[PDB]
């Protein structure tokens, strides 16, 4: 499965969640931004690995990215 | 009238009841065929499908191969004949390694009903899963099918070469 | 307030012309890369993403429609005006067997004159292939000043066009529901515009062509021949050449139409003086099929109680095997632009290809089936003509399917019936690609292989393993004997291509049997195979245009897009476009083998001389039956030694067709610059060269980009297009003048 | 006509789920419509819905997806997809905690939040042999 | 036997026993698990 | 001479170059009539070799074994109108071009609208510029002098 | 004519007017002086 990582830069304008294509990522509380949240990946077992969640990031350099990894029948989209 | 429909009632199958998936000319074909007609033991299913196909597998490799006659020669039907036997050869050695590496079974149409009711907390993929319950779907079962095979096809392509050499001679 | 347009929609301002990307909500904001110069040109005739009323749209289709026929009247106009000027007409219309048709001469710079070729009939120029020669002789244009006045008008109706279209889109655009009038659009292209046409040609071929190709045919020089104005005033200079018009009109309003049979024959075959159709005979056809599509434009009901409703017509065919049938098809062709362009387009590609082909088969006009250079040309031409439009036709069935499609409209239908089933349609026209494949080619390379082995006997040949066209030499022969039999009121074959006697024009071949071997058998099915994978390939962009297992909603990424992402195993070219770009590729591969086809059997088994005796020599020498058959002879027996003449061609008149063979080399070579490489890359080189002009102060304000990944695409295939299709241009163009 | 009443009135396509929704894994996705409206299958075309409960089922997590997000266009919200694995053994999955994930919900822990941006990853060199 | 008779019994041998082989080890240790 | 060649003067292979070319195209004279435009610009054609010819003979050109100039560009101002002079020119004219795009550049670079008049020239502060390039030389060693010419660390720069 | 002339400042047809402009002098330099091989002084 592909891994993903979201760094602090997050500035919880949750574009990476609501452009995630398998639900992988979801807003979670925090303190370090104005939006009072940031942005988790708890079900990277679902990462396809189309990166929709990087493109939709407004940050400088993206603060949610996913490094591909090992491939599974769920991580290569294979409907068969 | 509608002539397609779902399978089986089934609208979220990757498949279409058509007048050529489940007609009933389909249905009595393909049960009358070896690989599906009942009453067979495995090796009977291999030998009637290896004696078919070395019949009609000798045929090209006689007619058109490197050692022709338009007339009836000798030679040109054993070439056609010791092709037709290497290549079922290689079949046989095709069949005997899928079945190697594609069955872990002894005797099927049980152990999934043993692992659905004695529990099957175990390795799976013996226990559990098992793909298809035909006797063909096991190692005996495929090994025996393989023998059938193999034996039949070299029956089969000595018939067909016996039978080319009397059209060609009293015809 | 009329009914149908409306009054000074748009108001004539330059102040639009100063504003570039004002069409476009994303693009008027103005340029902050380089980018947006691409998207802005890529974006001009897309007029459904510029406004969102089906009106607006297609009042700038109607007002481009003219536009094109402007330009179109303005190259007309500008060909007979080169006729008329800077042309030898009138020294080939004295000479047309031994003169070539010249009509732009060369100016004298940089040592470029050697193009002013040896043309004969006392001119210099370029050797013209287009054979406007031989059209405006069947014409009866006997004069240069004919050619000036037909330049004139061509002037003339370019500017109305063009003041057509500013008028329908400025002062007076037409409405949607005159738009949507498909039942009396079609009632008046097929009567008025198609059969009127036809009518309107048929009175010119009769009381113009008729006589003064006769008197040509007879030996009568073009300034003895009286004007054409002379053919109508005076009904004895027509009655001389035809003794049937001494009975005036009054045969057709009697209903004796026999009595017309001198000038409205059935004769078939070609003329023996020039070589082309009888012109009776092209004006009977002409006044058949202007009767014809004047009576099939009655038929669709359009303001009175008469008449035929597509939508009644349509909605009545349904079947067991297809639900619905074609319910809502006149609701998709009726609110869709992009649909009737896909059918449009298809039918008009195909028309051409077919054009193309019974052009060299029925040589049409004088003195045209001779001219070599002419008939290979227009071949060429017209079948790339055909190629291209038939994939723009699955390229806009494609947009149709993203854009213009709805779910709901589409219920159960065909179109909807055609999706639900893409993967068994695409699955088996997959297996039948594989299998014509593996068969026609590889057939070639056993023939090959054999051939290298030293066994001549094992081939696909005719003195080896044959295999004969028998279903196509059956045509053949019921066509040849259809004069008597089946056609008993014909007196030779529609072609001598089916079979019958050579036709020779000053001992050059006009036309002959073409003899199908299994030679032409492998061809044949080479060009079927490589049809089906073109077809293929656009069917498979058309059906998986709007989702697939893949990407389930493709649709949402629109028709143009690069890709998905590199995930699921990577998503690249799965647009519908990446489908039209491959098709693209395809297209040009079977289009090139067609034309390959066509110049070495033409050239091997049907062009050539002919001897007083009657001995048939050919430019090549029969090579094709024997040689065709390996892709080392096609390689040989073709490419090399056809090619020359272009090699050769450096110091003489036709050194320009070897500078265009390289440069056509030289671009087909940077296509694949294009296509083979990637955006990151250049976009990381061009990051360097910033660095440099920024340490110049030298940087742009609109910022370097490289080109987006569908136009890196699109750059690749239209200059693989070019450079191919040019190399090709100047190999057929330079082999065919030269012998 | 169909095996439950509760389906879609879909005519069956060659593009539903295969052995894989078999013996690997299967996905269903609920949802209550107030009108039978006409929608596009994720897998093939044309659908119409039940005026009450629906059911469907596919072969991937992403159809089911794409079929919730085509659903919020009809103003249904209340779709629910869950993961049927080869016995009936059915796990909720996308309204994970009954709050979409685009909204924040108290609960939900971060998973993958790393307490520095880009720049503070660690060199590859020093993640070697290792 | 002679030198020359050694293509005629090695040729063959090597060029199309040794691929047979060679596939079926290659295809069993490839389709093992674990 | 320099490189083993000969001046195209005194080389034989030149002169038959030059007779062999006017003979195909007096050849190709023949086949016209009288003072038609043909063969007045055949006659033009031929006038314009012999021109040509008896130039180069007379230019202090070298020519090699197969009688056609070539140039010594290795830096000597004997041959120095082949190479050195065209040389300076180009570079004249190349300098003037740079200089006044660099120059347009920097100018509308202070505007509120740079990008804008990149896509739509101001023409008179373009013809403004483009006139002001014959002192490019001049411009550029006054401009490098006072530190003008040259950016030094507000440039970007990658991460490595 | 104010917006007409902003049109003609537009860079495709101020390109166009100067290439075409620059092809014209170096071919009528080549007409009237040509084969010039090297420089003519
Ligand atoms: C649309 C089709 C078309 C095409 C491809 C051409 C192409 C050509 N024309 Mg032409 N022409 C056309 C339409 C066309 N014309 C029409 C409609 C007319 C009638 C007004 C003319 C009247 C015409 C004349 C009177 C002459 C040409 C000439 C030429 C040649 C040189 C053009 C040139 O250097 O202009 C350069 C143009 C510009 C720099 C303007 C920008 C060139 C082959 C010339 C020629 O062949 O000389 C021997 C020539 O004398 N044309
Ligand atoms: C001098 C006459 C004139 C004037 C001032 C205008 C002015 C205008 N037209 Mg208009 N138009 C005219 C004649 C004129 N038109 C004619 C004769 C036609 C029929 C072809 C049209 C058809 C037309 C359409 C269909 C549309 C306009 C539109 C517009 C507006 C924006 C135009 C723009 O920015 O594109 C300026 C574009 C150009 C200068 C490009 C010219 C393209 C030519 C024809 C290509 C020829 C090249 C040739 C083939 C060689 C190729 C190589 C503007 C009010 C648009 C509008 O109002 O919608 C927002 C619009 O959609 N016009
Ligand atoms: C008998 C009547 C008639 C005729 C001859 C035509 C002819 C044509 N129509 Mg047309 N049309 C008609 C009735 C007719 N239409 C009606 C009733 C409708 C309403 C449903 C339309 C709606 C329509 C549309 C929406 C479009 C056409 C287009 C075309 C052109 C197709 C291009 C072509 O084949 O090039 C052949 C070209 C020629 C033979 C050149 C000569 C043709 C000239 C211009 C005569 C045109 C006849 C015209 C209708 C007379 C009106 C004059 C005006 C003062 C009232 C062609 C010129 C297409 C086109 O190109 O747009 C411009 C297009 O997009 N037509
Ligand atoms: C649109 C096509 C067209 C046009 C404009 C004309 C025009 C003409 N034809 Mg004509 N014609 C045509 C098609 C056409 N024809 C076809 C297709 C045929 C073959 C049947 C003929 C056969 C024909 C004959 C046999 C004769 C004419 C004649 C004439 C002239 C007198 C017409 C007359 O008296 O009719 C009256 C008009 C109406 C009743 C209306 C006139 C110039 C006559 C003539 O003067 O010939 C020189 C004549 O004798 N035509
Ligand atoms: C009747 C013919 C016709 C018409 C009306 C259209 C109309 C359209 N097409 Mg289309 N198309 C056609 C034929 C046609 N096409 C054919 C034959 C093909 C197959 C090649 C295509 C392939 C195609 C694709 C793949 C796409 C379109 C698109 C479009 C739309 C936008 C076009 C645009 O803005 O381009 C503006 C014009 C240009 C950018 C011109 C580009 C210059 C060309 C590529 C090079 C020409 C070189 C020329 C031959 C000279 C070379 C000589 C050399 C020596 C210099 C528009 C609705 C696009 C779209 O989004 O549709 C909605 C799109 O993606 N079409
Ligand atoms: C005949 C085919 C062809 C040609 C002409 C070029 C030309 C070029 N490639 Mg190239 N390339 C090709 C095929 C070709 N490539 C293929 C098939 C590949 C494999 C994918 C590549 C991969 C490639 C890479 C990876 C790079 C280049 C680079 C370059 C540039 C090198 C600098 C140079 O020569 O400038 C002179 C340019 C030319 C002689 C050609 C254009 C000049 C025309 C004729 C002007 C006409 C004006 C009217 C140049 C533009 C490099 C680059 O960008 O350097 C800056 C670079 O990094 N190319
Ligand atoms: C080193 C590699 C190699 C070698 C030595 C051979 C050898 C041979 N090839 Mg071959 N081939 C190869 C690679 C090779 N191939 C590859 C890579 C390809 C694909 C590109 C081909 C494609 C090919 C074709 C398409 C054909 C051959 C044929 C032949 C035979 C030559 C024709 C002849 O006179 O025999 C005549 C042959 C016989 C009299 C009978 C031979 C039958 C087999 C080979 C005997 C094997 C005996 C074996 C020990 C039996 C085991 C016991 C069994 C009874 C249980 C010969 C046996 C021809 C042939 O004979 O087809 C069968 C033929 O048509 N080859
Ligand atoms: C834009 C650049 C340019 C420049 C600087 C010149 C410069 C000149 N031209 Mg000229 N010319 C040009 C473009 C140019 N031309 C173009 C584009 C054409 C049309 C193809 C002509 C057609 C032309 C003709 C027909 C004549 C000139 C002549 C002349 C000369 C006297 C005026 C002068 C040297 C005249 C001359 O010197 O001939 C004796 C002359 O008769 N020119
Ligand atoms: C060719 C076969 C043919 O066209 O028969 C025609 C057959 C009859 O369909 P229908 O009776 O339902 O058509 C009635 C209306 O749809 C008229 O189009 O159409 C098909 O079943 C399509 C299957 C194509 C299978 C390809 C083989
Ligand atoms: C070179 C290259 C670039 C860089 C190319 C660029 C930036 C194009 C530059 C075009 C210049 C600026 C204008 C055209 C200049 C020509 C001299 C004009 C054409 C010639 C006329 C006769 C038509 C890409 O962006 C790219 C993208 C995707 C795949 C491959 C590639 C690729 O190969
Ligand atoms: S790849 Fe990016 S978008 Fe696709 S799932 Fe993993 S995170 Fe969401
Ligand atoms: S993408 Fe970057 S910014 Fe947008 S939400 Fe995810 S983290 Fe916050
Ligand atoms: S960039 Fe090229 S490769 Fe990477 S995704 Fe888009 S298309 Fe596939």
């Given at each position: 499965?592909?891994?993903?990582?979201?760094?602090?830069?997050?500035?919880?304008?949750?574009?990476?969640?609501?452009?995630?294509?398998?639900?992988?990522?979801?807003?979670?509380?925090?303190?370090?931004?104005?939006?009072?949240?940031?942005?988790?990946?708890?079900?990277?077992?679902?990462?396809?690995?189309?990166?929709?969640?990087?493109?939709?990031?407004?940050?400088?350099?993206?603060?949610?990215?996913?490094?591909?990894?090992?491939?599974?029948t769920?991580?290569?989209?294979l409907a068969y | 009238?509608?002539?397609?429909?779902?399978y089986?009632?089934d609208?979220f199958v990757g498949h279409l009841?058509?007048?050529?998936?489940?007609?009933?000319?389909?249905?009595?074909?393909?049960?009358?065929?070896?690989?599906?007609?009942?009453?067979?033991?495995?090796?009977?299913?291999?030998?009637?499908?290896?004696?078919?196909?070395?019949?009609?597998?000798?045929?090209?490799?006689?007619?058109?191969?490197?050692?022709?006659?338009?007339?009836?020669?000798?030679?040109?039907?054993?070439?056609?004949?010791?092709?037709?036997?290497?290549?079922?050869?290689?079949?046989?050695?095709?069949?005997?390694?899928?079945?190697?590496?594609?069955?872990?079974?002894?005797?099927?149409?049980?152990?999934?009903?043993?692992?659905?009711?004695?529990?099957?907390?175990?390795?799976?993929?013996?226990?559990?899963?098992?793909k298809?319950?035909?006797?063909?779907?096991?190692?005996?079962?495929?090994?025996?099918?393989?023998?059938?095979?193999?034996?039949?096809?070299?029956?089969?392509?000595?018939?067909?070469?016996?039978?080319?050499?009397?059209?060609?001679?009293?015809? | 307030?009329?009914?149908?347009?409306?009054?000074?929609?748009?108001?004539?301002?330059?102040?639009?012309?100063?504003?570039?990307?004002?069409?476009?909500?994303?693009?008027?904001?103005?340029?902050?890369?380089?980018?947006?110069?691409?998207?802005?040109?890529?974006?001009?005739?897309?007029?459904?993403?510029?406004?969102?009323?089906?009106?607006?749209?297609?009042?700038?289709?109607?007002?481009?429609?003219?536009?094109?026929?402007?330009?179109?009247?303005?190259?007309?106009?500008?060909?007979?005006?080169?006729?008329?000027?800077?042309?030898?007409?009138?020294?080939?219309?004295?000479?047309?067997?031994?003169?070539?048709?010249?009509?732009?001469?060369?100016?004298?710079?940089?040592?470029?004159?050697?193009?002013?070729?040896?043309?004969?009939?006392?001119?210099?120029?370029?050797?013209?292939?287009?054979?406007?020669?031989?059209?405006?002789?069947?014409?009866?244009?006997?004069?240069?000043?004919?050619?000036?006045?037909?330049?004139?008008?061509?002037?003339?109706?370019?500017?109305?066009?063009?003041?057509?279209?500013?008028?329908?889109?400025?002062?007076?655009?037409?409405?949607?529901?005159?738009?949507?009038?498909?039942?009396?659009?079609?009632?008046?292209?097929?009567?008025?515009?198609?059969?009127?046409?036809?009518?309107?040609?048929?009175?010119?071929?009769?009381?113009?062509?008729?006589?003064?190709?006769?008197?040509?045919?007879?030996?009568?020089?073009?300034?003895?021949?009286?004007?054409?104005?002379?053919?109508?005033?005076?009904?004895?200079?027509?009655?001389?050449?035809?003794?049937?018009?001494?009975?005036?009109?009054?045969?057709?309003?009697?209903?004796?139409?026999?009595?017309?049979?001198?000038?409205?024959?059935?004769?078939?075959?070609?003329?023996?003086?020039?070589?082309?159709?009888?012109?009776?005979?092209?004006?009977?056809?002409?006044?058949?099929?202007?009767?014809?599509?004047?009576?099939?434009?009655?038929?669709?009901?359009?303001?009175?109680?008469?008449?035929?409703?597509?939508?009644?017509?349509?909605?009545?065919?349904?079947?067991?095997?297809?639900?619905?049938?074609?319910?809502?098809?006149?609701?998709?062709?009726?609110?869709?632009?992009?649909?009737?362009?896909?059918?449009?387009?298809?039918?008009?590609?195909?028309?051409?290809?077919?054009?193309?082909?019974?052009?060299?088969?029925?040589?049409?006009?004088?003195?045209?089936?001779?001219?070599?250079?002419?008939?290979?040309?227009?071949?060429?031409?017209?079948?790339?003509?055909?190629?291209?439009?038939?994939?723009?036709?699955?390229?806009?069935?494609?947009?149709?399917?993203?854009?213009?499609?709805?779910?709901?409209?589409?219920?159960?239908?065909?179109?909807?019936?055609?999706?639900?089933?893409?993967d068994?349609?695409?699955?088996?026209?997959?297996?039948?690609?594989?299998?014509?494949?593996?068969?026609?080619?590889?057939?070639?390379?056993?023939?090959?292989?054999?051939?290298?082995?030293?066994?001549?006997?094992?081939?696909?040949?005719?003195?080896?393993?044959?295999?004969?066209?028998?279903?196509?030499?059956?045509?053949?022969?019921?066509?040849?004997?259809?004069?008597?039999?089946?056609?008993?009121?014909?007196?030779?074959?529609?072609?001598?291509?089916?079979?019958?006697?050579?036709?020779?024009?000053?001992?050059?071949?006009?036309?002959?049997?073409?003899?199908?071997?299994?030679?032409?058998?492998?061809?044949?099915?080479?060009?079927?195979?490589?049809?089906?994978?073109?077809?293929?390939?656009?069917?498979?962009?058309?059906?998986?245009?709007?989702?697939?297992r893949?990407?389930?909603?493709?649709?949402?990424?629109?028709?143009?897009?690069?890709?998905?992402?590199?995930?699921?195993?990577?998503?690249?070219?799965?647009?519908?476009?990446?489908?039209?770009?491959?098709?693209?590729?395809?297209?040009?591969?079977?289009?090139?083998?067609?034309?390959?086809?066509?110049?070495?059997?033409?050239?091997?088994?049907?062009?050539?001389?002919?001897?007083?005796?009657?001995?048939?020599?050919?430019?090549?020498?029969?090579?094709?039956?024997?040689?065709?058959?390996?892709?080392?002879?096609?390689?040989?027996?073709?490419?090399?030694?056809?090619?020359?003449?272009?090699?050769?061609?450096?110091?003489?008149?036709?050194?320009?067709?070897?500078?265009?063979?390289?440069?056509?080399?030289?671009?087909?070579?940077?296509?694949?610059?294009?296509?083979?490489?990637?955006?990151?890359?250049?976009?990381?080189?061009?990051?360097?060269?910033?660095?440099?002009?920024?340490?110049?102060?030298?940087?742009?304000?609109?910022?370097?980009?490289?080109?987006?990944?569908?136009?890196?695409?699109?750059?690749?295939?239209?200059?693989?297009?070019?450079?191919?299709?040019?190399?090709?241009?100047?190999?057929?163009?330079?082999?065919?003048?030269?012998? | 006509?169909?095996?439950?009443?509760?389906?879609?009135?879909?005519?069956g396509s060659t593009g539903g789920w295969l052995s894989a929704a078999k013996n690997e894994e299967k996905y269903?996705?609920?949802?209550?419509?107030?009108?039978?409206?006409?929608?596009?299958?994720?897998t093939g075309?044309?659908?119409?819905?039940?005026?009450?409960?629906?059911?469907?089922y596919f072969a991937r997590?992403?159809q089911?997806?794409?079929?919730?997000?085509?659903?919020?266009?009809?103003?249904?919200?209340?779709?629910?997809?869950?993961?049927?694995?080869?016995?009936?053994?059915?796990?909720?999955?996308?309204?994970?905690?009954?709050?979409?994930?685009?909204?924040?919900?108290?609960?939900?822990?971060?998973?993958?939040?790393?307490?520095?941006?880009?720049?503070?990853?660690?060199?590859?060199?020093?993640?070697?042999?290792? | 036997?002679?030198?020359?008779?050694?293509?005629?019994?090695?040729?063959?041998?090597?060029?199309?026993?040794?691929?047979?082989?060679?596939?079926?080890?290659?295809?069993?240790?490839?389709?093992?698990?674990? | 001479?320099?490189?083993?060649?000969?001046?195209?003067?005194?080389?034989?292979?030149?002169?038959?170059?030059?007779?062999?070319?006017?003979?195909?195209?007096?050849?190709?004279?023949?086949?016209?009539?009288?003072?038609?435009?043909?063969?007045?610009?055949?006659?033009?054609?031929?006038?314009?070799?012999?021109?040509?010819?008896?130039?180069?003979?007379?230019?202090?050109?070298?020519?090699?074994?197969?009688?056609?100039?070539?140039?010594?560009?290795?830096?000597?101002?004997?041959?120095?109108?082949?190479?050195?002079?065209?040389?300076?020119?180009?570079?004249?004219?190349?300098?003037?071009?740079?200089?006044?795009?660099?120059?347009?550049?920097?100018?509308?670079?202070?505007?509120?609208?740079?990008?804008?008049?990149?896509?739509?020239?101001?023409?008179?502060?373009?013809?403004?510029?483009?006139?002001?390039?014959?002192?490019?030389?001049?411009?550029?060693?006054?401009?490098?002098?006072?530190?003008?010419?040259?950016?030094?660390?507000?440039?970007?720069?990658?991460?490595? | 004519?104010?917006?007409?002339?902003?049109?003609?400042?537009?860079?495709?047809?101020?390109?166009?007017?100067?290439?075409?402009?620059?092809?014209?002098?170096?071919?009528?330099?080549?007409?009237?002086?040509?084969?010039?091989?090297?420089?003519?002084?």
């Amino acid at each position: 499965s592909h891994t993903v990582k979201i760094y602090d830069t997050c500035i919880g304008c949750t574009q990476c969640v609501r452009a995630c294509p398998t639900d992988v990522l979801e807003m979670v509380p925090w303190d370090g931004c104005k939006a009072g949240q940031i942005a988790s990946a708890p079900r990277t077992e679902d990462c396809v690995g189309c990166k929709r969640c990087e493109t939709a990031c407004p940050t400088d350099f993206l603060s949610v990215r996913v490094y591909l990894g090992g491939e599974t029948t769920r991580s290569l989209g294979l409907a068969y | 009238v509608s002539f397609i429909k779902p399978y089986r009632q089934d609208p979220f199958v990757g498949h279409l009841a058509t007048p050529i998936t489940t007609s009933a000319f389909t249905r009595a074909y393909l049960k009358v065929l070896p690989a599906y007609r009942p009453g067979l033991t495995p090796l009977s299913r291999g030998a009637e499908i290896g004696f078919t196909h070395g019949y009609f597998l000798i045929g090209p490799f006689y007619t058109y191969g490197p050692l022709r006659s338009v007339e009836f020669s000798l030679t040109s039907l054993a070439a056609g004949l010791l092709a037709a036997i290497t290549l079922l050869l290689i079949l046989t050695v095709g069949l005997s390694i899928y079945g190697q590496v594609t069955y872990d079974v002894y005797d099927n149409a049980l152990i999934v009903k043993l692992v659905r009711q004695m529990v099957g907390s175990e390795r799976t993929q013996d226990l559990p899963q098992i793909k298809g319950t035909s006797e063909l779907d096991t190692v005996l079962g495929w090994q025996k099918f393989s023998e059938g095979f193999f034996s039949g096809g070299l029956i089969g392509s000595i018939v067909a070469a016996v039978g080319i050499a009397l059209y060609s001679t009293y015809l | 307030k009329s009914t149908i347009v409306d009054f000074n929609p748009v108001e004539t301002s330059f102040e639009k012309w100063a504003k570039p990307g004002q069409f476009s909500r994303t693009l008027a904001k103005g340029p902050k890369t380089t980018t947006w110069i691409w998207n802005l040109h890529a974006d001009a005739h897309d007029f459904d993403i510029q406004t969102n009323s089906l009106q607006e749209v297609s009042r700038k289709i109607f007002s481009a429609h003219f536009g094109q026929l402007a330009v179109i009247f303005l190259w007309l106009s500008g060909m007979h005006f080169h006729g008329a000027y800077f042309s030898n007409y009138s020294a080939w219309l004295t000479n047309p067997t031994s003169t070539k048709p010249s009509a732009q001469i060369v100016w004298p710079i940089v040592g470029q004159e050697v193009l002013n070729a040896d043309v004969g009939g006392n001119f210099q120029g370029i050797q013209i292939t287009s054979g406007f020669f031989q059209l405006w002789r069947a014409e009866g244009i006997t004069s240069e000043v004919e050619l000036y006045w037909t330049a004139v008008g061509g002037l003339v109706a370019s500017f109305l066009m063009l003041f057509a279209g500013w008028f329908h889109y400025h002062k007076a655009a037409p409405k949607l529901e005159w738009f949507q009038n498909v039942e009396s659009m079609l009632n008046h292209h097929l009567a008025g515009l198609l059969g009127l046409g036809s009518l309107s040609w048929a009175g010119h071929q009769i009381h113009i062509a008729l006589p003064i190709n006769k008197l040509l045919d007879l030996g009568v020089s073009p300034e003895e021949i009286p004007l054409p104005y002379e053919f109508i005033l005076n009904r004895d200079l027509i009655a001389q050449l035809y003794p049937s018009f001494n009975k005036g009109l009054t045969p057709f309003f009697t209903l004796n139409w026999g009595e017309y049979s001198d000038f409205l024959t059935f004769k078939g075959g070609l003329n023996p003086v020039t070589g082309g159709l009888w012109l009776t005979d092209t004006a009977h056809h002409h006044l058949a099929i202007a009767v014809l599509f004047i009576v099939a434009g009655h038929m669709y009901k359009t303001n009175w109680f008469l008449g035929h409703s597509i939508k009644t017509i349509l909605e009545a065919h349904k079947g067991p095997f297809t639900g619905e049938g074609h319910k809502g098809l006149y609701e998709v062709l009726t609110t869709s632009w992009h649909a009737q362009l896909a059918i449009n387009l298809a039918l008009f590609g195909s028309l051409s290809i077919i054009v193309a082909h019974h052009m060299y088969a029925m040589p049409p006009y004088p003195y045209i089936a001779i001219d070599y250079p002419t008939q290979l040309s227009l071949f060429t031409h017209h079948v790339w003509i055909g190629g291209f439009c038939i994939v723009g036709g699955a390229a806009h069935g494609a947009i149709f399917f993203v854009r213009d499609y709805n779910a709901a409209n589409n219920y159960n239908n065909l179109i909807d019936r055609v999706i639900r089933h893409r993967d068994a349609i695409i699955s088996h026209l997959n297996w039948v690609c594989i299998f014509l494949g593996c068969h026609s080619f590889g057939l070639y390379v056993h023939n090959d292989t054999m051939r290298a082995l030293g066994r001549s006997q094992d081939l696909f040949s005719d003195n080896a393993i044959a295999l004969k066209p028998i279903f196509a030499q059956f045509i053949q022969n019921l066509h040849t004997l259809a004069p008597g039999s089946t056609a008993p009121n014909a007196l030779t074959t529609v072609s001598y291509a089916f079979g019958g006697d050579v036709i020779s024009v000053g001992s050059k071949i006009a036309m002959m049997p073409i003899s199908l071997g299994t030679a032409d058998f492998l061809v044949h099915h080479i060009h079927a195979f490589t049809i089906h994978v073109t077809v293929l390939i656009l069917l498979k962009g058309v059906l998986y245009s709007r989702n697939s297992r893949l990407i389930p909603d493709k649709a949402n990424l629109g028709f143009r897009f690069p890709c998905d992402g590199p995930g699921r195993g990577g998503t690249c070219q799965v647009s519908a476009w990446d489908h039209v770009f491959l098709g693209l590729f395809w297209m040009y591969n079977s289009i090139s083998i067609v034309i390959f086809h066509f110049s070495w059997k033409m050239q091997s088994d049907v062009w050539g001389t002919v001897s007083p005796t009657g001995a048939v020599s050919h430019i090549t020498g029969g090579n094709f039956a024997q040689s065709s058959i390996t892709i080392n002879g096609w390689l040989r027996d073709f490419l090399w030694s056809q090619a020359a003449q272009v090699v050769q061609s450096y110091g003489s008149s036709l050194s320009a067709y070897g500078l265009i063979f390289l440069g056509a080399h030289f671009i087909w070579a940077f296509s694949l610059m294009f296509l083979f490489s990637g955006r990151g890359y250049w976009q990381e080189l061009i990051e360097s060269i910033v660095w440099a002009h920024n340490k110049l102060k030298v940087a742009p304000s609109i910022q370097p980009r490289a080109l987006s990944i569908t136009q890196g695409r699109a750059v690749g295939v239209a200059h693989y297009l070019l450079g191919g299709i040019g190399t090709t241009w100047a190999f057929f163009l330079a082999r065919i003048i030269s012998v | 006509k169909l095996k439950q009443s509760d389906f879609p009135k879909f005519e069956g396509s060659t593009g539903g789920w295969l052995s894989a929704a078999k013996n690997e894994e299967k996905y269903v996705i609920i949802w209550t419509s107030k009108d039978a409206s006409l929608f596009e299958m994720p897998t093939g075309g044309t659908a119409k819905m039940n005026a009450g409960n629906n059911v469907a089922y596919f072969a991937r997590k992403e159809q089911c997806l794409a079929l919730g997000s085509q659903l919020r266009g009809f103003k249904i919200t209340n779709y629910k997809i869950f993961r049927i694995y080869p016995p009936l053994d059915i796990t909720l999955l996308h309204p994970f905690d009954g709050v979409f994930p685009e909204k924040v919900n108290q609960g939900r822990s971060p998973v993958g939040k790393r307490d520095a941006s880009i720049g503070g990853n660690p060199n590859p060199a020093s993640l070697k042999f290792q | 036997m002679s030198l020359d008779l050694l293509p005629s019994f090695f040729v063959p041998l090597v060029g199309l026993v040794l691929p047979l082989f060679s596939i079926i080890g290659l295809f069993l240790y490839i389709e093992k698990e674990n | 001479d320099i490189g083993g060649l000969n001046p195209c003067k005194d080389s034989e292979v030149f002169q038959k170059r030059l007779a062999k070319t006017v003979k195909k195209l007096e050849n190709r004279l023949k086949k016209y009539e009288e003072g038609t435009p043909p063969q007045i610009a055949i006659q033009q054609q031929i006038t314009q070799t012999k021109q040509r010819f008896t130039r180069y003979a007379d230019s202090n050109l070298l020519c090699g074994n197969d009688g056609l100039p070539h140039l010594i560009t290795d830096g000597r101002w004997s041959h120095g109108s082949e190479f050195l002079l065209p040389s300076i020119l180009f570079l004249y004219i190349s300098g003037w071009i740079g200089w006044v795009g660099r120059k347009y550049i920097r100018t509308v670079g202070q505007t509120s609208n740079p990008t804008e008049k990149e896509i739509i020239i101001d023409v008179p502060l373009a013809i403004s510029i483009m006139t002001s390039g014959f002192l490019w030389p001049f411009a550029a060693w006054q401009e490098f002098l006072s530190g003008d010419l040259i950016a030094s660390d507000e440039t970007i720069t990658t991460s490595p | 004519m104010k917006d007409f002339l902003k049109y003609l400042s537009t860079a495709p047809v101020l390109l166009t007017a100067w290439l075409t402009f620059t092809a014209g002098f170096v071919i009528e330099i080549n007409r009237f002086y040509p084969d010039a091989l090297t420089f003519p002084f």
